[PDB]
Design a protein around this ligand. Sequence first.
Ligand SMILES: N[C@H]1CCCN(c2ccncc2Nc2ncc3ccc(-c4c(F)cccc4F)nn23)C1
Length: 273
Amino acid sequence: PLESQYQVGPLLGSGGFGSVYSGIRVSDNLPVAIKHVEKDRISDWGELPNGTRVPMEVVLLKKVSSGFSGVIRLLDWFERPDSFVLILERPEPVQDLFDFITERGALQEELARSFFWQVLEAVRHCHNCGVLHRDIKDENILIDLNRGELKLIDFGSGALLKDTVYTDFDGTRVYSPPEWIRYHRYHGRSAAVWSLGILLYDMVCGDIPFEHDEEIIRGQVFFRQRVSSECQHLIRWCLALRPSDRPTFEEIQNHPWMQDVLLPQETAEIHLH
Ligand SMILES: N[C@H]1CCCN(c2ccncc2Nc2ncc3ccc(-c4c(F)cccc4F)nn23)C1
């Protein structure tokens, strides 16, 4: 079933998330990504309408599946004796935002605006669908280089969105908020906004603002690169120490820095082609 349907290519990456390979669907040559996750390494388990036990990642991906292109599409999944295999869409050509920033260094603000806006729209979509990603970062954002469209990947640390406190966390520590570091407690939306602040800083400075717990806890943001006052203000707002002092998604998108965003295709023409 699986081995007949797909031609496996090189390894794209491995780590805490598992192992992910490039591949091709034999029937129609469709580019895909093939993600393997060992059962023992899965703590978060969900359940389909069937009653079938699957990784929460599959549940979340199904919940966010639609025409909306800002989230990676799950094409299929398979259970093996000791692992699960996910077949995902693969844009081509594509580059993840981490590599993109490594190559380019600090992004021009017009480009960071387009990218950040698309990330916000994607994250809003997830939340509307009842899904919290919990690992928003440059490494988990794909750039469709022809269309100038960004997509969220790796819902392996995510969870169902709830209004009560989370006391578990398996995402990336340097993107995690001060309330997690200090109290091992956070709420979904305000934690997401913190991680978005980290992301935005990363885009416009070419590196993350905090390395150590004490930096995160203190929350003093220093700019190493030239960044506009409007952008600095939004970043500092997202990175408010008190969760309730952070902006809502609406307030982020209504912020002066976020106005007159380019269309994805405009973005590709100007910055990517
Ligand atoms: N920073 C990326 C490196 C590649 C693997 N990666 C992932 C980690 C956890 N889950 C999934 C992924 N990757 C993933 N899921 C679907 C896709 C689709 C495309 C890609 C991809 C990519 F992320 C980089 C370069 C080429 C690619 F095809 N990765 N990808 C993080």
